[PDB]
Amino acid sequence: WMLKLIVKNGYVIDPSQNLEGEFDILVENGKIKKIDKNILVPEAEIIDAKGLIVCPGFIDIHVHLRDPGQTYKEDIESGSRCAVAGGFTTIVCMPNTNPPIDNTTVVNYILQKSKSVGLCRVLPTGTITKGRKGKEIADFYSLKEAGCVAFTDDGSPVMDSSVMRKALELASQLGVPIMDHCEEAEEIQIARDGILAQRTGGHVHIQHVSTKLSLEIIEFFKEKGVKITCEVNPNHLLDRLALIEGVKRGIIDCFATDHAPHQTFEMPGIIGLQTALPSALELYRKGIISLKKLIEMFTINPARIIGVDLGTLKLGSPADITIFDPNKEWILNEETNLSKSRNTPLWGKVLKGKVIYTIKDGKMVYKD
Ligand SMILES: [Zn+2]
């Protein structure tokens, strides 16, 4: 027990604050006390981050932890392990559990398991409808009391478009976002949500986008000031061409893995938490985005979507810090796979860029 951590000698990047440079970080009592050149204080753990990139803990707003219900595919513990090894200090879990996250009991189980694992923050989402069934609007006042940070029906989508409408109405008084899509229909669903979003004032977040029209559609509503955001999974990216384009223009707000543990295979998609970064770094290596923007899409933008004050290194914030070497080579296989599943096309490829430390509330929760 010392209360004090110094991360010396790394390149700090904090897009939230426009901060970039060779700084040291003083961490004190869970929280960030100082950023400055050349720091030394008695009574502190030093971490030599020379050569490495130091930035806010990544946040991922789209993960399937499969818990309860399908914990052979994955569960809160192995999911949290994946997460911290991939530089994530907060993951948002989706409600297509069994039983589904539609009552406080399940919320409360998920928070409890979470505190016991100890590794990263898990924030619950609630379903939009009771039992995700499609008919009745769920109890938002109480699920948000209990700790839910978004509502979604993940893998049934509200076709009944006046349900979706009530969802956005209530979402907007409670100040939480509605998430949609997963599994010309895509474009029509996105335009419906945008239209419905502007009328209601509610924030809609689009979870899958696959075509140039959809991006243009979202981009249209965004310039009209509609509160509509979207994500792309960076393991996807290797018109798939226009997705790369929309990351460029800044139309896609954040990366989110849509970590999707499967045991049989033969939409369904793929595990992702441990490979997101080397993935996203490929775009940086081919010059599609800078390092600032790539960190932006893992930190502050996702933070802003689910409205939590994370993803910064503001003096005060919780010391949620990721430290990575963008140049280190490693291979996802049995040796290094921390997921209970195995389902990603990246298995056995050489990936480039590995997280070296993950710090949450000032405690080390992962070390290489
Ligand atoms: Zn999903």
Side-chain angles (χ1 to χ4, degrees):
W1 27 242
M2 45 268 329
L3 35 154
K4 280 166 181 183
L5 175 68
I6 335 197
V7 170
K8 297 180 72 42
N9 290 314
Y11 198 64
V12 169
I13 302 174
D14 179 352
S16 87
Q17 271 196 241
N18 258 29
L19 199 201
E20 169 157 16
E22 289 181 330
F23 297 114
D24 286 352
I25 303 177
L26 185 55
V27 153
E28 193 192 77
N29 244 315
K31 282 172 258 62
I32 309 263
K33 171 136 272 321
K34 181 201 282 177
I35 307 171
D36 198 37
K37 299 213 167 155
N38 168 239
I39 280 166
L40 193 58
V41 301
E43 239 89 326
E45 275 158 43
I46 277 144
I47 296 158
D48 178 22
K50 197 145 186 18
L52 299 165
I53 279 143
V54 173
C55 68
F58 290 170
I59 296 150
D60 176 359
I61 61 166
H62 194 155
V63 167
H64 296 266
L65 286 188
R66 301 306 194 212
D67 186 347
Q70 295 138 28
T71 68
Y72 64 91
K73 312 212 174 113
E74 197 92 274
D75 81 21
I76 295 184
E77 203 187 339
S78 69
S80 309
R81 279 193 177 109
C82 275
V84 298
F88 291 83
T89 44
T90 303
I91 58 169
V92 182
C93 83
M94 304 278 88
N96 61 319
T97 44
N98 177 38
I101 321 187
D102 71 358
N103 63 52
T104 58
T105 269
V106 198
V107 172
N108 189 97
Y109 157 83
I110 284 189
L111 293 159
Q112 278 270 60
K113 238 280 226 323
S114 207
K115 284 172 230 339
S116 303
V117 186
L119 291 169
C120 59
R121 247 162 279 259
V122 188
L123 310 176
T125 58
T127 63
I128 302 213
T129 63
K130 296 197 179 66
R132 270 192 330 119
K133 282 206 160 73
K135 309 118 187 340
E136 203 156 61
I137 216 90
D139 196 3
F140 286 2
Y141 187 102
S142 279
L143 285 149
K144 143 146 224 319
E145 225 14 59
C148 284
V149 296
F151 299 100
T152 176
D153 249 15
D154 227 303
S156 130
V158 259
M159 310 285 86
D160 192 350
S161 126
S162 57
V163 172
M164 181 62 151
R165 194 221 208 266
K166 308 156 202 169
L168 279 156
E169 234 155 55
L170 255 127
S172 102
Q173 299 144 4
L174 281 163
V176 286
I178 293 306
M179 313 181 175
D180 209 87
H181 215 216
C182 205
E183 321 172 295
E184 276 103 31
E186 182 168 272
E187 277 90 323
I188 293 156
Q189 205 180 327
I190 290 172
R192 170 208 68 166
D193 297 357
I195 287 165
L196 287 173
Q198 189 214 249
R199 306 309 232 29
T200 56
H203 170 197
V204 68
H205 184 259
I206 305 301
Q207 291 174 136
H208 186 254
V209 298
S210 89
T211 84
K212 151 151 235 257
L213 194 40
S214 285
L215 284 188
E216 280 170 327
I217 300 198
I218 288 141
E219 146 94 317
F220 159 74
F221 286 107
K222 279 189 166 203
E223 296 164 339
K224 260 52 208 181
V226 174
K227 295 157 181 213
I228 175 167
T229 49
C230 61
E231 72 197 39
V232 73
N233 171 18
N235 305 287
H236 250 72
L237 299 178
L238 216 64
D239 228 9
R240 219 215 65 158
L241 224 261
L243 279 190
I244 289 182
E245 196 79 72
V247 182
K248 248 163 147 276
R249 189 136 88 264
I251 302 176
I252 286 148
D253 306 87
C254 61
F255 300 108
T257 71
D258 189 26
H259 194 259
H262 300 300
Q263 294 290 57
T264 109
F265 317 36
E266 353 125 45
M267 197 201 142
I270 54 154
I271 66 162
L273 270 167
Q274 237 183 296
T275 61
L277 168 67
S279 266
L281 271 166
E282 194 107 275
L283 313 179
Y284 156 73
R285 260 189 292 267
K286 310 247 107 78
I288 283 102
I289 72 199
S290 46
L291 200 25
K292 185 190 192 146
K293 161 113 295 219
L294 163 144
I295 288 175
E296 198 181 280
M297 297 186 52
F298 270 128
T299 56
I300 187 56
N301 304 337
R304 278 169 210 217
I305 289 189
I306 57 141
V308 312
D309 185 61
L310 292 177
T312 55
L313 288 173
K314 279 209 185 85
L315 299 195
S317 327
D320 277 16
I321 297 147
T322 306
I323 304 178
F324 68 91
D325 179 358
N327 289 143
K328 181 179 203 32
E329 265 151 19
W330 70 289
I331 304 144
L332 190 71
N333 54 24
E334 331 70 52
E335 191 173 305
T336 68
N337 180 31
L338 289 172
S339 191
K340 260 181 255 209
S341 297
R342 195 167 299 250
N343 63 301
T344 153
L346 277 183
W347 184 273
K349 316 304 269 182
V350 175
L351 305 166
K352 196 175 155 139
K354 181 154 165 44
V355 159
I356 300 305
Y357 303 103
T358 307
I359 290 160
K360 195 231 151 196
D361 294 309
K363 306 208 276 324
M364 246 203 274
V365 298
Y366 176 90
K367 169 144 87 106
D368 207 34

